């Protein structure tokens, strides 16, 4: 575990930087695929994976990776905070400033975080007892990120995307 | 596109935050898998996907997504800044403070960024001309992120790992 402050600060900025690099590469892969460049898409994705590897290394160096119930608890904390603190204020600030798109995207994320926080809480309870959770499917709306376990409604209750557009993890 | 300074700033923070939440969850998905919770793993990978959606929404709203040639330029600059500015400094600081883990993870990232900078620079000359790159495989070292196209070395030059440990993207 890194213990010095400056080095801890730097590995944190690098952790942030590797996560933005991975996310940008994923967004790029998907644009490249869309524009008729599948091999560039393939390049962006594999480099994405390199960045996940660096980010993952910085994270462990920081001693921030625990066992699943502590991981779940970190996700609970992250999500609860975006729900109570970060998004409501970013959302109110976009609206205050007239930025309709920023209203849309922060509203999209806020409604999803509320769900994510509940799910991680319910999952920790089972994790806290040596047990896996029992689920078949998870649906994610690819417009807003609304998230539903096992049964999802026929349209996204956030943006109205039909259930056929949902991404399914099973 | 968001224009007002404060909402812009909040959207860059949310995009970083969305990005660091996708990443933590990818990492937690592997730990969960490693500890015998495949479904918890699955719930992490699925929520990670919703965060990719949020992050992509923020990034499109900041107007940061171009055609592939510009996305590659954003890549080249990212990597170059890391090669020339960030990782050399963070790695000297960590060596100045005796933080050997941080010296390892910053070295591992730096050596991978050199390669990434070069790859994107060559993906660009091809993309500037309306053409896909012509490649069949990319190899990534799961320990240090080292990156090789079409041909793997017999072992990894950065961390020693044998070729047979490389993740292939094809
Ligand atoms: Fe990296
Ligand atoms: Fe979330
Ligand atoms: Fe939706
Ligand atoms: Fe989110
Ligand atoms: Fe890189
Ligand atoms: Fe390696």
UniProtKB/TrEMBL annotation, chains A, B:
Binding residues annotated for Fe(3+) 1, in chain numbering: 18, 51, 54, 113
Residues the entry annotates as binding Fe(3+) 3: 51, 79, 113, 116
Residues reported to bind Zn(2+) 1: 18, 51, 54, 82, 113
Residues that, per the record, bind Fe(2+) 3: 141, 144, 156, 159
Pfam families, per database record: Rubrerythrin (PF02915), RUBY_RBDX (PF21349)
Ferritin-like diiron domain mapped to chain residues: 1-131
Molecular function as annotated in GO: iron ion binding; oxidoreductase activity
Amino acids binding Fe(2+) 1: 18, 51, 54, 113
Binding site residues for Fe(3+) 2: 18, 51, 82, 113
Ranges in a coiled coil: none
Residue sites binding Zn(2+) 2 per the record: 51, 79, 82, 113, 116
Superkingdom classification of source: Archaea
Alphabetically ordered keywords of this record: Electron transport, Metal-binding, Transport, Zinc
Signal peptide interval: none
Protein name: Rubrerythrin
């Amino acid at each position: 575990v890194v213990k010095r402050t400056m080095t801890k600060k730097f590995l944190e900025e690098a952790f942030a930087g590797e996560s933005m690099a991975h996310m940008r590469y994923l967004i790029f892969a998907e644009k490249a695929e869309q524009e008729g460049f599948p091999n560039i898409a393939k390049l962006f994705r594999a480099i994405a994976y390199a960045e996940f590897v660096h980010a993952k290394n910085h994270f462990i160096a920081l001693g921030k990776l625990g066992k699943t119930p502590e991981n779940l608890q970190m996700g609970i904390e992250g999500e609860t905070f975006e729900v109570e603190e970060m998004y409501p204020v970013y959302n109110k600030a976009a609206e205050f400033q007239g930025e309709k798109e920023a209203v849309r995207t922060t509203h999209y994320a806020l409604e999803a975080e509320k769900i994510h926080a509940e799910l991680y809480r319910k999952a920790k309870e089972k994790a806290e007892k040596g047990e896996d959770i029992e689920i078949k499917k998870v649906y994610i709306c690819p417009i807003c990120g609304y998230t539903a376990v096992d049964e999802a409604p026929e349209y996204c209750p956030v943006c109205g995307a039909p259930k056929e557009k949902f991404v399914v993890f099973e």
